[PDB]
């Protein structure tokens, strides 16, 4: 189906412990593939997926530069932004960048991204048109005007519409076996009597790719929200994902309940009874 | 492949 490439940059200031920390992570859908740690001894972009290892030294040289240029910008920006907000000398701050693109199952371009956040909340964001910006506030407005005088959006659209998709297309083909695949969930169901008149019914889903899954509890086909506990989709660690949805029900009324499973790797949506 | 342009100050 649909595919995406996302790069995540985290720069955290740390006074006393010298210059700030910069972590860079690369993603193709729900698969991490590249990484940069400004604290690591290598001082290079390193592989984290098998198919990216293939890429030449000229590739790895380029990636190192781009990510080093960005971290060095972030160190300055961490100071500049603290000034923009008229903030206090003492404390650690965070700058978060997220960018990348979306493609179709055909490979055709869908959307480009560039979003920035200072201390957990939005700062500056590139609109879907990839021509304009959105300032979260007045400090963000300074960057907005600075970046309009620098033709940032113009240069950003060039990457996102161009090279971002060319790179996504390349990776999707090279790592075809691990990326262009959909392994369905391994569903099972458990009973836990929490009372002599009540019991917790858990609907399980193990080892599935990608992360997009939908687990719903239906009493006589009618979907429930009440007593429906839902855990956040957690990574197994081997590249697949896990998720459970449980509901507390009265004893003897187990037959009225079904768990409806929706995943890309499934030929038909699953329906399970006790 | 990571973005190389623009990498400009805020």
């Amino acid at each position: 189906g649909s595919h995406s490439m996302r790069y995540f940059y985290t720069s955290v200031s740390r006074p006393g412990r010298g210059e700030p920390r910069f972590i860079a992570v690369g993603y193709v859908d729900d698969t991490q593939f590249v990484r940069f740690d400004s604290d690591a001894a290598s001082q290079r972009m390193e592989p984290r997926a098998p198919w990216i290892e293939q890429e030449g030294p000229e590739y790895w040289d380029q990636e190192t530069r781009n990510v080093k240029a960005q971290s060095q910008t972030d160190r300055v920006d961490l100071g500049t932004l603290r000034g923009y907000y008229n903030q206090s000398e003492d404390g650690s701050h965070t700058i978060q960048i997220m960018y990348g693109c979306d493609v179709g199952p055909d490979g055709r371009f869908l959307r480009g991204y560039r979003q920035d956040a200072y201390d957990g909340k939005d700062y500056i964001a590139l609109n879907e048109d990839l021509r304009s910006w959105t300032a979260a506030d007045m400090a963000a407005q300074i960057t907005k005007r600075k970046w309009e005088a620098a033709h940032a959006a113009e240069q950003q659209r060039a990457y996102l519409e161009g090279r971002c998709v060319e790179w996504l297309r390349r990776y999707l083909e090279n790592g075809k076996e691990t990326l262009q695949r959909t392994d369905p969930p391994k569903t099972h169901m458990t009973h836990h009597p929490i009372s002599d008149h009540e019991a917790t019914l858990r609907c399980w889903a193990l080892g599935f790719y990608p992360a997009e899954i939908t687990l719903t509890w239906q009493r006589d086909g009618e979907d429930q929200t009440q007593d429906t506990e839902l855990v956040e989709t957690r990574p197994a660690g081997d590249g697949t994902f896990q998720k459970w949805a449980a509901v507390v029900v009265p004893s003897g009324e187990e037959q009225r309940y079904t768990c409806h499973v929706q995943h890309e790797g499934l030929p038909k949506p699953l329906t399970l009874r006790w | 492949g990571t973005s190389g342009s623009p990498i400009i100050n805020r």
Epitope: Q62, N66, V76 | -
Partner: T-cell receptor, first 115, second 108 residues
Framework: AGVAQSPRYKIIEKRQSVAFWCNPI?????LYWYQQILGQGPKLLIQ????????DSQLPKDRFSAERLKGVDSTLKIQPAKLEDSAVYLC?????????????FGSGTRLTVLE | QPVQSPQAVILREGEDAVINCSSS?????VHWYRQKHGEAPIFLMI?????EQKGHDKISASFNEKKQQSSLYLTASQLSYSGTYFC??????????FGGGTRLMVKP
């Protein structure tokens, strides 16, 4: 304004030491050091993004050193010099990186290392 | 790494000449600089995919993606057109790798 480069010309003996100072265009985040032997195509030495180093792969680290501490002006040092070093040392500046930005070069420092 | 077509050209003022820049690896941005005497190379044009064909004074340059090449067109020379012309190659982060150079002398 323009990129400032000091000195204009420099004379150094075979194994002596020398520093080349450079001030970029005001507010420019990117700073470059190129070496131009005779009239030929300038060759990259080091690239900067404010206080830090983006690429020093082409630096003969056995003698060459470069620092831009406050992310403004920079100083390229050769310790000790060699007769192979006599060339024009060029410094350019870009607003950042840059696909639409053209470099702005300084007049360069002509160094002549002698016997 | 870029390859410059004529290393040296001696034109008679009023004549036209083309400088060609070649690349083995795909393009990003192509820069053109003119260096006179013992002085700093002055910037002429930068070309990206967004465009492609551009100008500086009476000099025009073209960028071709499929051919992985850029050419500099000098028409009706002005004798002030001397001397060296360099083409720069753009990295993903725009980091110049200069071509050989074209030492152009215009005779009046």
């Amino acid at each position: 304004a323009g990129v400032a480069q000091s000195p204009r010309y420099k004379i150094i003996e075979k194994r002596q030491s020398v520093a080349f100072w450079c001030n970029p265009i005001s507010g420019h985040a990117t700073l470059y050091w190129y070496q131009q032997i005779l009239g030929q195509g300038p060759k990259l030495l080091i690239q900067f993004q404010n206080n830090g180093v983006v690429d020093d792969s082409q630096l003969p680290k056995d003698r060459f050193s470069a620092e831009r501490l406050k992310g403004v002006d920079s100083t390229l040092k050769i310790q000790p010099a060699k007769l192979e070093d006599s060339a024009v040392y060029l410094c350019a500046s870009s607003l950042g990186q840059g696909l639409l930005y053209g470099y702005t070069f300084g007049s360069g420092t002509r160094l002549t290392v002698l016997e | 790494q870029p390859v410059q077509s004529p290393q040296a050209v001696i034109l008679r003022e009023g004549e036209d000449a083309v400088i060609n820049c070649s690349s083995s690896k795909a393009l990003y941005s192509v820069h053109w600089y003119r260096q006179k005497h013992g002085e700093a190379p002055i910037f002429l044009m930068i070309l990206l995919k967004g465009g492609e064909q551009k100008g500086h004074d009476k000099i025009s340059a073209s960028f071709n993606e499929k051919k992985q090449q850029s050419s500099l067109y000098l028409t009706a020379s002005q004798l002030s057109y001397s001397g060296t012309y360099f083409c720069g190659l753009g990295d993903a982060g725009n980091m110049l790798t200069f071509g050989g150079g074209t030492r152009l002398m215009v005779k009046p």
